[PDB]
């Protein structure tokens, strides 16, 4: 809806500070997005606004399309996706900055 889809990218490796989350994330990150939806930077006041919009649209769209295939995400998945998509949305912002 005026949103672009960026190129696929490496999913960042997150350390959570405890072995359970660390292992859960490593084993499940293939289920999470590896490209983000974004609007052009020129439609946002600052980077924080670009990023928050990017996180929420990406996760919402990812939840919808994977649900049709039978995916089931729990709260742990959503909070991990919020953390990894946040970093990937920051990267997308930086990729759009490199266009200059």
């Amino acid at each position, epitope marked *: 809806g005026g949103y672009m889809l960026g190129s696929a990218m490496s999913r960042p490796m997150i350390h959570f500070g405890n072995d*359970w989350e660390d292992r*859960y994330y490593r*084993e499940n990150m293939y289920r999470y997005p590896n490209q983000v939806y974004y609007r052009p930077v020129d439609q946002y006041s600052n980077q924080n606004n670009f990023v*928050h919009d990017c*996180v*929420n649209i990406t996760i919402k769209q990812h939840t919808v399309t994977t649900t049709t295939k039978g995916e*089931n995400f*729990t*709260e*742990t998945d*959503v*909070k991990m996706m*919020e953390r990894v998509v946040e970093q990937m949305c920051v990267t997308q912002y930086q990729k759009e900055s490199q266009a200059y």
Partner: antibody, heavy 115, light 112 residues
Framework: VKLQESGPQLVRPGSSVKISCKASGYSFTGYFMHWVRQTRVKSLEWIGRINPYNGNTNYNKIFKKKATLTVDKSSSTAYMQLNSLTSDDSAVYFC?????????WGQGVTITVSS | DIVMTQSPAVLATSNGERATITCKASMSVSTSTYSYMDWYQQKPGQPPKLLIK???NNETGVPARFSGSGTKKDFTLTIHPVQQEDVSTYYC?????????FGAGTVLELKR
């Protein structure tokens, strides 16, 4: 980690109430917040949850339009407002922090709906 | 909603002996690597206290005489040896989806 709820309330049938849940000691937006009530029969009845990160909510739809969940990120406080209360809504209401498990709870708020 | 059938409704157990609480879910709440079952303990006048999450992981500070086990549809909370402070009502709860529904509860009481 602490979840601190507002005090007990006596409300007349048909009116509204707003209960607060002040969180401290952790990243407020990093966890969902659930609201649940424990009835006279000791059964747990789910009201809904909110994601403080983006404000998204999921409600016990059997309730209809009885409850509204909000957060104030500035004060890291969660609010549950209940509308059009009846005597059957008398119960202890809890907020609880969650990531696939309710690991920290508020102390409970006893609401009595009575004339 | 997922229905969890918890039994027994009531349980009397001698000091130092073994108590076992069972939860059967109406559908699977596991994958081959993780099971989505929690156990709580509630004492009078207090909110429930989380003892075990993801079927088998003790919360910090919970003594090791509590243990969670099972998979798929069948889950168990075991207490051994049971101590006097263990008298209370215990609940299972799945975390597979919302709502995170509860079993009806088990009132555990000590003999003496």
């Amino acid at each position: 980690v602490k979840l601190q709820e507002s005090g007990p309330q006596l409300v007349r049938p048909g009116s509204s109430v707003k209960i607060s849940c002040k969180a401290s000691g952790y990243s407020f937006t990093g966890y969902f917040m659930h609201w649940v009530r424990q009835t006279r029969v000791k059964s747990l009845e789910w009201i809904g949850r909110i994601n403080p990160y983006n404000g998204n909510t999921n409600y016990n739809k059997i309730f209809k339009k009885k409850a509204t969940l909000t957060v104030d990120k500035s004060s890291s406080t969660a609010y549950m407002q209940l509308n059009s209360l009846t005597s059957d809504d008398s119960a202890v209401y809890f907020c609880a922090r969650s990531q696939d498990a309710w690991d920290y709870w508020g102390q409970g708020v006893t609401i009595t709906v009575s004339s | 909603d997922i229905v969890m059938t918890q039994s027994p409704a009531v349980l009397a157990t001698s000091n130092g002996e073994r108590a076992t609480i069972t939860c059967k879910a109406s559908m699977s709440v596991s994958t081959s690597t993780y099971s989505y079952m929690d156990w709580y303990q509630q004492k009078p006048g207090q909110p429930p206290k989380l003892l075990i999450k993801k079927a088998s992981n003790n919360e910090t500070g919970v003594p090791a005489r509590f243990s969670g086990s099972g998979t798929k549809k069948d889950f168990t909370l075991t207490i051994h040896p049971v101590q006097q402070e263990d008298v209370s009502t215990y609940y299972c709860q799945h975390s597979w989806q919302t709502p995170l529904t509860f079993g009806a509860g088990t009132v555990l009481e000590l003999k003496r």
